[PDB]
Amino acid sequence: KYIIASDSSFAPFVFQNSSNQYTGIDMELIKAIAKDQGFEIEITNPGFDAAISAVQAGQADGIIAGMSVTDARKATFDFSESYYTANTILGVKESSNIASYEDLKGKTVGVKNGTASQTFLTENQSKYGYKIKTFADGSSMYDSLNTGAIDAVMDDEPVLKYSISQGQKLKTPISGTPIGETAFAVKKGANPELIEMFNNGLANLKANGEFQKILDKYLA
Ligand SMILES: [Cl-]
Ligand SMILES: [Cl-]
Ligand SMILES: [Cl-]
């Protein structure tokens, strides 16, 4: 009944499993909310930009896709309450001694170019006195962490936690720094009852523990 458009490859929020179904925090959450609130949904996964288009054109009713709440997006979208605070966070090998940013003095931290993690590291470099090694892709960065060529990485918390949940022997010794909020969206001025039900469904799932179980599956 309500058409919900999403991305196809944005783990842990939405991704294809081995059975070629789309799963992830977002997929489970919207389904649980629809069931809690008694509406029907059809989920499509045309990709993030295509999902944006479909909602703006009125061919989809809502979008959920690890979507960052920004003032720019508020010009054309109405957002739900945040269901996830996105952080940047430090990652190290299991074996690492590092337990504070102060411990990074003289050490070298890897980061992906063009990211919020890079902004944080660059802005705090004088404060803590680490070197930064910049990478074009995550694979190269984590390869470097593995060989000990860098001492730590800075990355998106849900990405790092998902990888750790999946068995990667990394750890996060320092609490993350908030970079934004994540929410469901409808076209500005459209489908207000869907936002109302999403927020009510979210509150219900938080209150009865079901929300935390979804998060824990992917991030713990
Ligand atoms: Cl809004
Ligand atoms: Cl980023
Ligand atoms: Cl690189």
Pick the ligand that lies closest to the CA of residue 118: 2
Provide the number of structural domains found in the chain. Answer: 2
The verdict on 170 and 106 lying in the same domain is: yes
Cα 147 to ligand 3 centroid, rounded to whole Å? 15
Cα 6 to ligand 2 centroid, rounded to whole Å? 19
Cα 96 to ligand 2 centroid, rounded to whole Å? 25
Whole-number Å distance between alpha carbons of 14 and 93: 26
Cα 87 to ligand 2 centroid, rounded to whole Å? 10
Pick the ligand that lies closest to the CA of residue 149: 3
Whole-number Å distance between alpha carbons of 176 and 155: 10
Cα 145 to ligand 3 centroid, rounded to whole Å? 12
Whole-number Å distance between alpha carbons of 152 and 41: 42
Helix (H, G, I), strand (E, B) or coil at 183: coil
Whole-number Å distance between alpha carbons of 195 and 202: 10
Cα 39 to ligand 2 centroid, rounded to whole Å? 34
The verdict on 94 and 175 lying in the same domain is: yes
Helix (H, G, I), strand (E, B) or coil at 5: strand
Helix (H, G, I), strand (E, B) or coil at 93: strand
Cα 78 to ligand 1 centroid, rounded to whole Å? 4
Q: Are strands 62-63 and 185-187 parallel, antiparallel or unpaired?
A: antiparallel
Whole-number Å distance between alpha carbons of 64 and 126: 38
Identity of the residue numbered 197: M
144-172 b/e (C-beta count within 10 Å ≥ 16 → b)? bbeeeebbbbbbbbbbbbbbbeeeeebbb
Pick the ligand that lies closest to the CA of residue 180: 2
Contact 15, 22 (CB under 8 A): yes
The verdict on 97 and 114 lying in the same domain is: yes
Helix (H, G, I), strand (E, B) or coil at 10: strand
Q: Which two tokens stand for residue 107?
A: 């050490």
The verdict on 90 and 77 lying in the same domain is: no
Contact 12, 18 (CB under 8 A): no
* Among 121, 123, 58, CA closest to 90: 121
Q: Which two tokens stand for residue 61?
A: 């009713």
Whole-number Å distance between alpha carbons of 173 and 30: 31
The verdict on 174 and 197 lying in the same domain is: no
Please give the C-alpha separations between residue 165 and each of 70, 159, 161, 172, 201, in angstroms, as whole numbers. 28, 10, 6, 12, 26
Q: Which CATH number does the domain housing residue 42 bear?
A: 3.40.190.10
Cα 153 to ligand 3 centroid, rounded to whole Å? 13
The verdict on 155 and 97 lying in the same domain is: yes
Token match 């508020």: residue? Answer: 74
Range of the domain at 33: 1-85+181-220
The verdict on 78 and 92 lying in the same domain is: no
The verdict on 79 and 1 lying in the same domain is: yes
Cα 204 to ligand 3 centroid, rounded to whole Å? 44
Q: What are the φ and ψ backbone dihedral angles of 42, each rounded to 5 degrees?
A: -120, 125
Angle between helices 210-219 and 25-37 in degrees, nearest 10: 170
Contact 159, 176 (CB under 8 A): no
Q: Which two tokens stand for residue 194?
A: 């869907």
Cα 134 to ligand 3 centroid, rounded to whole Å? 7
Helix (H, G, I), strand (E, B) or coil at 92: strand
The verdict on 176 and 205 lying in the same domain is: no
Please tell me what resolution, in angstroms, this structure has: 1.6
CB-based contacts of 178, cutoff 8 Å, min separation 6? 85, 86, 87
